[PDB]
Amino acid sequence: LNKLVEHIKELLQQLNKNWHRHQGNLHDMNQQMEQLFQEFQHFMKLQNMIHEMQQFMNQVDNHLQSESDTVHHFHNKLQELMNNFHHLVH
Amino acid sequence: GKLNKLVEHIKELLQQLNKNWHRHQGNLHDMNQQMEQLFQEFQHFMQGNQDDGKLQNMIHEMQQFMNQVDNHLQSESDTVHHFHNKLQELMNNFHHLVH
Ligand SMILES: [K+]
């Protein structure tokens, strides 16, 4: 019956595990880019290399914006679902 | 040299992050669809059910599960913001370093 609730609680477990894995990759990403800033600081054309660093950082900036937008989209939908639920029961 | 090999490595890492995320975005879709069907099944239950105690027990169970997803999503959002803003700090610093 309404024991999709046991099942879906288990889906959250799986997705939470998948999340820490992705968070790990976010720390490692942040790790390399800090190492790389330090390299550039030491070496301060090389401004073609600078141009490429800026363009790569731009990519990461755009990707994390997409990550945010996506979390907010699903979070918003969860809210709507809780609102629907509330009106259902009240 | 050390500078070049990091630039390739970090680019491979971004591509690996793009793929991992698409998988996570897929999972968020799934969760959203699963919870939609959870809601539909609840509606079916509420319809048939005539026992107020069992209804109230199930309402509680539903609220608590939704709260867990709510809390976890707020946690995904906080982590992305933390790392996004760290990057933006680095980007600003770097801009001023090279100009
Ligand atoms: K009823």
Side-chain angles (χ1 to χ4, degrees):
Chain A
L1 40 26
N2 212 5
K3 281 324 150 192
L4 316 188
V5 178
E6 211 171 50
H7 178 247
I8 204 165
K9 273 170 182 183
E10 292 182 13
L11 297 207
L12 190 63
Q13 301 172 342
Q14 225 145 34
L15 132 57
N16 197 36
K17 289 193 192 202
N18 285 36
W19 177 249
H20 291 329
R21 166 162 177 160
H22 164 89
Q23 168 170 131
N25 300 129
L26 290 181
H27 168 71
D28 291 344
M29 173 64 67
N30 181 85
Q31 202 82 334
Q32 325 295 328
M33 237 162 344
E34 182 64 48
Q35 299 283 261
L36 202 41
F37 176 103
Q38 300 295 126
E39 280 304 319
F40 269 101
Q41 189 156 39
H42 180 94
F43 287 119
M44 281 306 299
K45 290 281 195 74
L46 174 95
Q47 66 186 149
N48 296 327
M49 195 101 67
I50 277 156
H51 163 261
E52 208 192 38
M53 180 53 23
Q54 287 172 324
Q55 296 294 127
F56 175 76
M57 296 174 103
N58 279 356
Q59 275 203 80
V60 184
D61 183 35
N62 291 335
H63 177 69
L64 296 179
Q65 195 48 65
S66 71
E67 286 200 14
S68 272
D69 288 357
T70 293
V71 174
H72 302 142
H73 167 85
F74 291 102
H75 205 174
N76 252 67
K77 284 185 84 68
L78 172 67
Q79 318 271 33
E80 290 176 15
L81 186 277
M82 299 173 336
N83 185 62
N84 289 330
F85 181 75
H86 171 280
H87 281 105
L88 185 61
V89 305
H90 291 277
Chain B
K2 185 187 269 74
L3 189 69
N4 293 351
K5 283 166 172 163
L6 288 183
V7 163
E8 317 179 62
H9 184 270
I10 208 164
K11 280 168 187 279
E12 288 155 8
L13 265 196
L14 184 56
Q15 202 167 126
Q16 286 166 43
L17 198 73
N18 253 302
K19 293 163 190 168
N20 263 247
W21 176 257
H22 178 64
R23 186 166 302 104
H24 180 71
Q25 186 159 307
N27 288 342
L28 285 178
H29 272 100
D30 280 2
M31 179 55 75
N32 177 105
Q33 293 303 105
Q34 285 297 307
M35 299 190 72
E36 234 304 303
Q37 286 266 19
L38 189 55
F39 182 95
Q40 292 302 334
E41 275 320 309
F42 180 78
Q43 223 184 324
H44 185 235
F45 163 90
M46 185 182 32
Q47 289 160 2
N49 175 70
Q50 299 176 357
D51 178 330
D52 187 55
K54 292 183 84 190
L55 174 64
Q56 296 315 322
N57 286 354
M58 208 61 218
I59 290 176
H60 174 81
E61 205 66 29
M62 293 287 285
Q63 286 164 343
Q64 292 236 99
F65 179 73
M66 293 175 190
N67 285 346
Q68 293 187 254
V69 180
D70 184 47
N71 285 338
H72 169 86
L73 288 175
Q74 181 63 242
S75 178
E76 300 197 0
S77 169
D78 289 331
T79 282
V80 177
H81 274 262
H82 177 250
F83 281 116
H84 204 176
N85 232 88
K86 278 187 67 164
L87 167 76
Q88 302 212 124
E89 198 215 42
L90 201 75
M91 286 172 76
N92 198 240
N93 284 346
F94 182 77
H95 190 77
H96 289 291
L97 188 260
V98 299
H99 284 295

